Structure 1
Amino acid sequence: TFKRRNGGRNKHGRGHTKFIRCSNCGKCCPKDKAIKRFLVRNIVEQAAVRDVQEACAFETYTLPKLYLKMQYCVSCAIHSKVVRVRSVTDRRVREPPQ
Structure 2
Amino acid sequence: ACVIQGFAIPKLYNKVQYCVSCSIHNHIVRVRSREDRKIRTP
TM-score by length of 2: 0.90
Percent identity among equivalent residues?
Answer: 57
Runs of 4+ deviating beyond 4 Å: none
Structure with higher helix content: 2
Q: Which has the higher contact order (CA 8 A, sep 6+)?
A: 1
2:4 is aligned with 1:67: no
Amino acid in the other structure paired with 1:78: I
Partner of 1:67: helix, strand, or coil?
A: coil
Structure with higher strand content: 1
Matches within 5 A, 1:53-92: 55-92=1-38
Aligned length: 42
Q: Distance in 2 between matches of 1:83 and 1:56?
A: 40
TM-score by length of 1: 0.41
For structure 2, list consecutive stretches of 5 or more residues without a partner in the other structure: none
2:39 is aligned with 1:93: yes
What RMSD in Å do the two structures reach over aligned CA positions?
A: 0.7
Q: Distance in 2 between matches of 1:76 and 1:57?
A: 43
Amino acid in the other structure paired with 1:63: I
